[PDB]
């Protein structure tokens, strides 16, 4: 006969002991563990709510790969990717480039907690977490690899995070700050609670439904399988946050949460938002980016925060207002600067798309629509050269994204500048500037792509020079995803 899990599970995490040949602070250096003056004994109250053991893991995860790799192999000769909507192809090329190496890099973020957390249950769940992200990095390399012969773009599944292309820099800036350069407890909060529980878990659910709506069952099955791993390791921040709140550290806990939710949101509104509102074909749009946010992300945070004895972040009302704006800016930025990304952006501003936009966001045509009006006229009138840039946009020193916001009849673009130790910094929001001022030595001598251009680091110091600096050449440089087909509706 076999025991029941519950009868022996606790012994798997009864692993703390009182070191004697080295000190506690040597074995758990505070810069790696982040125990924050809370004792080993108080950290042992950590109790993960989703439990699992080694033999259950290897059996359940073996069956996941069997299923996902079988689907991929059965569908591979059909070549769906060669007849997919090109907004869909672009969605995948963006996804793989931005995420595959960061999933893999996460495994190290998990390894940080596995070694350095004082909470023994955290150390073992993060060992499974480390295994999960090893899987995610690998499978998200093996899948796009099937397409390398289809186009170079697919090489960016591996190459992107090794470049200085500006979207890659924004990705590392986010990930290195949440998960690679922080103590174990901070990683549990900032990555697993704020970002994985808070955004990516629901983002992968939507992405899998979108892939099946587009007729891509390989990718639907891939994303869907990866999503089922999330909660096993995403759960790790909740218990760390309860311990910090019970032991007189609610302010520190609050501050980590505030920073991580804001920084998550800026990356998410730049890369997911435009996908939902512009790349997915009109008749496949279940809901708007803003609707997705209100239904599946925002209430969930409020409920988590409430259950944890924490508050809504100071910027919550601004954040709500930004749902009508931020991603419309990042889309227009990426489309207008399209040769600077490694996928083809879909404009998404046909007459029917613009009426959808107007229903979903009253005022869009009066604001966003104005810039697209000018761009559309130039394309109708054979001046395509006025639809690509001859300078760099200003970049935020925190999120490393363009500083952009409402244009047209309700102009509202602002720069949250900061002078600090003799240098002038630019920030795209009040919260971005605040992440910097609460912790200036974490960010001070970082330079964004604009900083580098201005300092002489990009040579030749011109647009062709900046493209080479970003590893971008013709064949990978982006262009309009439908080859300007939608311009016909305007003549």
């Amino acid at each position: 006969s076999m025991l029941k899990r519950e009868d022996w599970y606790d012994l798997t995490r009864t692993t703390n002991w009182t070191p004697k040949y080295v000190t506690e602070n040597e074995l758990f250096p505070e810069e790696m563990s982040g125990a924050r003056g809370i004792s080993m004994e108080a950290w042992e109250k950590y109790d993960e709510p989703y439990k699992i053991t080694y033999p259950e893991y290897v059996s359940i995860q073996r069956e996941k790969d069997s299923g996902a790799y079988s689907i991929k192999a059965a569908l591979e000769r059909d070549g769906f990717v060669d007849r997919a909507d090109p907004g869909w192809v672009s969605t995948m090329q963006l996804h793989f480039g931005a995420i595959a190496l960061e999933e893999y890099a996460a495994s190290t973020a998990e390894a940080r907690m596995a070694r350095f957390a004082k909470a023994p249950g955290n150390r073992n769940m993060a060992t499974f977490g480390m295994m999960d992200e090893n899987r995610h990095g690998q499978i998200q390399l093996y899948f796009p690899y099937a397409n390398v012969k289809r186009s170079r773009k697919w090489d960016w599944a591996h190459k992107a995070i090794h470049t200085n292309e500006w979207a890659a820099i924004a990705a590392r800036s986010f990930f290195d700050d949440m998960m690679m350069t922080r103590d174990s407890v901070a990683v549990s909060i900032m990555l697993t609670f704020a970002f994985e529980t808070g955004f990516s878990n629901m983002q992968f659910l939507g992405l899998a439904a979108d892939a099946a709506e587009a007729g891509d069952h390989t990718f639907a099955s891939l994303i869907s399988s990866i999503q089922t791993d999330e909660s096993r390791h995403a759960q790790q921040g909740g218990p760390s946050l309860k311990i910090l709140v019970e032991n007189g550290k609610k302010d520190e806990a609050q501050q980590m949460v505030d920073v991580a939710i804001w920084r998550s949101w800026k990356l998410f509104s730049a890369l997911t938002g435009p996908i939902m509102d512009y790349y997915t074909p009109l008749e496949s749009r279940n809901q708007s980016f803003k609707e997705f946010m209100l239904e599946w992300i925002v209430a969930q945070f409020e409920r988590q925060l409430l259950d944890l004895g924490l508050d809504k972040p100071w910027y919550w009302d601004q954040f709500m207002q930004d749902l009508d704006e931020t991603h419309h800016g990042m889309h227009l930025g990426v489309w207008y600067w399209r040769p600077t990304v490694w996928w083809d952006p879909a404009a998404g501003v046909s007459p029917e798309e613009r009426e959808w936009l107007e229903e979903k966001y009253p005022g869009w045509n009066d604001t966003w629509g104005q810039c697209w009006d000018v761009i559309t006229d130039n394309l109708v009138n054979g001046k395509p050269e006025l639809t690509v840039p001859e300078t760099l946009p200003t970049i935020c020193n925190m999120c490393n994204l363009p500083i952009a916001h409402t244009p047209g009849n309700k102009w509202n673009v602002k720069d949250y500048q900061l002078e600090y130790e003799g240098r002038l910094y630019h920030f795209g929001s009040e919260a971005d500037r605040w992440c910097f001022q609460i912790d200036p030595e974490r960010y001070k001598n970082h330079t964004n792509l604009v900083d580098r251009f201005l300092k002489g680091e990009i040579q030749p110091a011109d647009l062709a020079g900046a493209l080479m600096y970003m590893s971008l050449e013709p064949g990978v440089m982006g262009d309009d995803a439908h080859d300007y087909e939608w311009v016909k509706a305007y003549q």
Binding site: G329, L332, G333, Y336, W368, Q370, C371, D373, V374, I375, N378, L386, T387, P389, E390, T391, L392, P393, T394, P402, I403, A404, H405, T406, P407, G408, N409, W411, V413, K414, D415, Q417, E419, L424, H426, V450, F453, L454
Partner: protein, 85 residues
């Protein structure tokens, strides 16, 4: 004499890097900024005059005042707005 500013052009959606010259007037700063916005993402307004103001405190610079005399920080953000005067 080349001096970088950030241009926040009225009714555009984005702030852009615009090299200007320390000897330019404000009028000449606005023209260098317009090049990157007018007829790209913003409609001309030929009945209006382009003016330059310091983004941070809202200080309006006269048309004829030159960059040299304006007390700007390198990379300072400038609003380029449509006025009657």
């Amino acid at each position: 004499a080349t001096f970088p500013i950030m241009s926040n052009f009225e009714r555009d959606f984005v702030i852009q890097l615009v090299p200007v010259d320390t000897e330019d007037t404000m009028d000449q700063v606005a023209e260098k900024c317009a090049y990157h916005s007018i007829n790209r993402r913003v409609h001309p307004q030929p009945e209006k005059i382009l003016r330059v103001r310091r983004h941070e405190d809202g200080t309006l610079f006269p048309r004829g005042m030159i960059v040299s005399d304006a007390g700007l920080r390198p990379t300072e953000t400038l609003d380029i707005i449509f006025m009657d005067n």
